[PDB]
Amino acid sequence: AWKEGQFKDIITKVANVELYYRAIQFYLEFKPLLLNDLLMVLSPRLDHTRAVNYFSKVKQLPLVKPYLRSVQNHNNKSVNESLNNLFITEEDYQALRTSIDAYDNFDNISLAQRLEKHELIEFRRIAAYLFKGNNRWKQSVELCKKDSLYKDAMQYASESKDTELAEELLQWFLQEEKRECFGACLFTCYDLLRPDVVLETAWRHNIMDFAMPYFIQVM
Amino acid sequence: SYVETELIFALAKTNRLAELEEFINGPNNAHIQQVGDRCYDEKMYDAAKLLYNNVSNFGRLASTLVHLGEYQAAVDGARKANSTRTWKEVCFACVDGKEFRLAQMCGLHIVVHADELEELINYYQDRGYFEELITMLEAALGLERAHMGMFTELAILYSKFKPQKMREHLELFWSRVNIPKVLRAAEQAHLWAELVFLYDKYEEYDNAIITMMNHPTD
Amino acid sequence: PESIRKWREEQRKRLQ
Amino acid sequence: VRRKDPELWGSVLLESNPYRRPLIDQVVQTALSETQDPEEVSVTVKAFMTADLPNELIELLEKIVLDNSVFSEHRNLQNLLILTAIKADRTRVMEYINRLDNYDAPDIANIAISNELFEEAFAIFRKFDVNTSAVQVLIEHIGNLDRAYEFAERCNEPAVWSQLAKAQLQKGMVKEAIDSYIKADDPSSYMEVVQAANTSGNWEELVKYLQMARKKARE
Amino acid sequence: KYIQAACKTGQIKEVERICRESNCYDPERVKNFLKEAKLTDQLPLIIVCDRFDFVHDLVLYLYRNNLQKYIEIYVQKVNPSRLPVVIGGLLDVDCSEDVIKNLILVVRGQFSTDELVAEVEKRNRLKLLLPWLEARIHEGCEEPATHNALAKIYIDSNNNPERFLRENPYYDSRVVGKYCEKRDPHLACVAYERGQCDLELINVCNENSLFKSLSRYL
Amino acid sequence: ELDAASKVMEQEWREKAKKDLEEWNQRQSEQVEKNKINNRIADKAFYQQPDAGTEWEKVAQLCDFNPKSSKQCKDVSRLRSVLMSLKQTPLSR
């Protein structure tokens, strides 16, 4: 006595919510192809947290991925975490950026600590982005310094708007032969550096670099 | 204000955005929305975008986003404008660009109206994308302001494009759809297996017995 | 692609 | 529903009729048919409250009527659902709080902290950005410094840092009470800090506290 | 020049009077100088602007710069008859709906009902007038304007509003029938039956509807 | 007999459901493998041949202060840096 063409409308007219879970179990047991439509039509009266918990207990998140992305508009913590885990599993880095830019109801620290160990450049970049968004200044810069030596950590140090941070980058560029980007680091961190000590360390204290356009703009 | 208006007009003429974006952010005190008209009148795009950005004038930015090429920003502006013309232009642009992921999303707020449904049908018939129209109208059930014409046109398209799925929709929404608009389409399709059932549902016993006598096969 | 041709032809053939 | 009469509901709801559950399962759908005015709904809910219905009978009606319907007002619809869910002592309180607005937050928070439910009041205080009333209750009831420190690190307010310093002083953490006052710039209660410093020689961190309080309270 | 001299020392109380009394000046330059020289307590513009009907930019300027008491005190004391225009202007930039729902609860003086329902229909945001209509029906307002809008909202509420049409005689059958003509004629039939609109009943049922309704009514 | 037939149909439906679940899992695994292959190709494309009077040109290419940087905050230091970049632009050879 089952007819999908009528059940898909009858299930939305019930009074309780346990029948929604019974229908979810029926679809997981017999016909998972219409589970997306069932979830989309039951969403106005379905508890998304318990649904995500059940989907994680049965491990069917890739089959409900579109419904989870649709529910993501409600900024649910469990839905956000499940979508982030699915994007990590699928080696996606664009959907992760979209999710972290649109919503923030999740633990950014744990996600960053997981992404920093996934050996991917995009994952560690997203981790540094989350760290700098969590007001963890002078920490994400040192984290990305391991790889972002091609004028990327300079941007983080500049947008940090803090002092005694770009000076460390200058000292690192002066101890090791990387004086080529010294002027770029000076220009990006103009409002965070002092020309006196910059010129002193750049000329007398270490290898005699010119760094003249910086002082020209200062004049 | 006229001075700054003519200044930004001359900047849009030579596409001097590098200083136009700075003059807009400052105390221009000009007459906004006056040069934005000449932007599309003289076919000068990429200039009205910065004009409508800082003013929050959702409804006219889509007219430039259509010719720009981006479709995500078109939907992001239409969801903020919530005007029929904006949604219709976004849907027409998505149809021109062979886009279907955002076409259904933008048409969900167009199929709500009765007159715009005919415009959508006319736009989708000349392009041949009947499957996209069917998939967009399938989501009409999951709405809060559906009317008779939507399901009527859905049943018509089922009777004309997908005969293997028209029976269920016809038996389900027989009372909601109108009588003449569906019977005329079914007669044009010459489907005698459902005309008798529809006549019996609407108590049209004369046209039912006439059809049964003229076609007693099934 | 002007699918009206097949649209009419298939239906007319089935009806005939 | 039509003939509003509290005496009728009182005479019918006496646990004598074995068909009370089908009557409830029918009235839960019949009540949506009126859709005219909340006066009849008010009379019916008053009759229900006077009949002393058990749990999972009124809060379900409120969840059905308030969501996906017209009756989304706030005329006594704040306590009628939240207090009932608290008396039921279930996880439905969090879902009701997350799916409701324009409700009196301090009163229900006080009612919750008076009862055994405390995480709901914490979520309420986090939703309305009430940091002080959350940390104070967390310290008074449980005193979990591990969560209070993270909560104070998340936000940024001198009152929150002062409350954290007071909580650390309650636990005898003089070493952290200086760091909790540097970020707050609060020169008050210095006499208590001086009295607590005499209990254990720690004249290395109090120096900075006094040097910073000198520029705030010339005593 | 007198207004300019009134800007050298604080005399804002003497500026709001001459804007209403005098009617032989150019309001363009006046409002430009007012928007340029911020008085920090300026409210002569919130009168002359609606006096010359240029509030389409005043609402935007208030939403951009600051919105604390200006529109509030305006609707309270100055002119409550322009509330729907300000609500539409605030909906143009898509502001918070809770702010508007809280502002509409404030008491009113001179006010028009049709001008607000027209704006919320143009914006397709009829879900904001529910608390105001509830307060009106609780106070005992026996006005057809306060009931026709509620009936149309119930029509758009995706429910079965049959008891409300057969029990409430306050609304107008013409508007409900014309609005529900292309959407659902089954409710328009009951509306016209309650309104005794025989000609409308003919023009609606005989065109596209069921004929048994007329057979049972006539 | 009808109950036995219903049990047989339920067993057949369970078998078909297991088959469909296996097919969906295989399709998802194939899609994940294709995505991993695409990510490996992208990581291999990341490998380039950069360095460890063209020095100034390479430094500019790395850190060009193009006027497009005006999208940031209107800081006076950023304006001075943009002016210095415009003055150094003629050094491009």
Residue numbers in the entry:
A (entry chain D): 1385 to 1603
B (entry chain G): 1167 to 1384
C (entry chain J): 99 to 114
D (entry chain I): 948 to 1166
E (entry chain H): 730 to 947
F (entry chain F): 115 to 166, 188 to 228
Paper quotes:
Clathrin-coated vesicles mediate trafficking of proteins and nutrients in the cell and between organelles. Proteins included in the clathrin-coated vesicles (CCVs) category include clathrin heavy chain (CHC), clathrin light chain (CLC), and a variety of adaptor protein complexes. Clathrin triskelia assemble into cages with pentagonal, hexagonal, and rarely heptagonal faces.
CCVs were purified from bovine brains in conditions that ensured that CHC cages do not disassemble during purification. The refined clathrin cages were further subjected to subparticle refinement to improve the resolution of the clathrin layer. The model by Morris et al. that was built into their consensus C3 vertex [pentagonal-pentagonal-pentagonal (PPP)] was docked into our C1 vertex. This discrepancy is consistent with observations that the knee domain changes conformation to make hexagonal and pentagonal faces, while the proximal domain is stabilized by CLC. Consistent with their study, our structure also showed that the CLC C-terminal domain stabilizes the tripod domains that are critical for CHC trimerization.
